[PDB]
């Protein structure tokens, strides 16, 4: 059965654990580990192996970046530093993978909040510059959570045909 190693990265408190638990448990959470879930995407069954990371020992961070097949780069829409810090997570992943081309999806989490400091258009334009998809999600309401993870799997599949 095809297996995909997914990694959720981003600054402290953006919602990495809440997004992962929402995909696994369908529940909004009120320790960093890995989670497994068999899913069907586009008529193909696969096993998702998801690592929830911290906002860590450098050698371990490099290992998860080396092992990871696809990365969800998460920022929160009310946290400008978390959005600016996407540059750093992207740079670190591309450096470890020694590739300009790594399956990645930019995620703007907390879309339910009325305290938005990052415009959708700003994050859209950044994602276009990076050549990656951009999705806004709410781990609280489950809005677009499956879309974020399933879009990441589709990017990994498109990459594997290259």
Ligand X SMILES: Nc1nc2c(ncn2[C@@H]2O[C@H](COP(=O)(O)OP(=O)(O)NP(=O)(O)O)[C@@H](O)[C@H]2O)c(=O)[nH]1
Which positions touch ligand X (CB under 6 A)?
A: 12-18, 54-55, 109-110, 112-113, 138-140
Tell which one of 11, 64, 149, 153 touches ligand A1IK8 (CB under 6 A): 64
- Residues with Cβ within 8 Å of residue 71, at least 6 apart in sequence: 6, 7, 8, 9, 89, 93, 102, 103, 104, 105, 152
Our finding on whether 10 is near ligand A1IK8 (CB under 6 A) is no
In the complex, minimum distance from the CB of residue 38 to Mg ion, in angstroms, rounded to a whole number: 23
Backbone φ and ψ for 9, nearest 5 degrees, come out as -125, 165
Task: Select the span of 21-29, 50-58, 90-98, 125-133 touching ligand A1IK8 (CB under 6 A).
Answer: 50-58
Identity of the residue, 68 or 108, whose beta carbon is nearer to ligand A1IK8 in the bound complex: 68
Measured CA distances, 3 to 36, 48, 68, 155 (Å) = 10, 6, 11, 14
In the complex, minimum distance from the CB of residue 161 to Mg ion, in angstroms, rounded to a whole number: 33
Strand partners, 44: 41
Q: Which does 5 bind (CB under 5 to 8 A by kind): Co ion, Mg ion, ligand A1IK8, none?
A: ligand A1IK8
Which H helix or E strand runs over 92?
helix 86-97
**Binding-site size, Mg ion (CB under 5 A):** 2
- Burial of 116: CB neighbours in 10 Å, binned 0-12, 13-18, 19+: middle
User: What is the dihedral sign for C-alpha 112, 117, 118, 121?
Assistant: positive
Site residues for Mg ion per CB under 5 A = 16-17
Which residues would be at the binding site for ligand A1IK8 (CB under 6 A)? Answer: 5, 7, 32-34, 49, 51, 53-54, 56, 60, 63-64, 67-68
């Amino acid at each position: 059965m095809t297996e995909y190693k997914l990694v959720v990265v981003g600054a402290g408190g953006v919602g990495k654990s809440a997004l992962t638990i929402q995909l696994i448990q369908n529940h909004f959470v009120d320790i960093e580990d890995s989670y497994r879930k068999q899913v069907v995407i586009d008529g193909e069954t696969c096993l998702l192996d998801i690592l929830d990371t911290a906002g860590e020992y450098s050698a371990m961070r490099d290992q998860y970046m080396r092992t990871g097949e696809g990365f969800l780069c998460v920022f929160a829409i009310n946290n400008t530093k978390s959005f600016e810090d996407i540059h750093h997570y992207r740079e670190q992943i591309k450096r470890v993978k020694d590739s300009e081309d790594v399956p990645m999806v930019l995620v703007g989490n907390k879309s339910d909040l009325p305290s938005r400091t990052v415009d959708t258009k700003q994050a859209q334009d950044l994602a276009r510059s990076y050549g990656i998809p951009f999705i806004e999600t709410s781990a609280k309401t489950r809005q677009r959570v499956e879309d974020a993870f399933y879009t990441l799997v589709r990017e990994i599949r498109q990459y594997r045909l290259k």
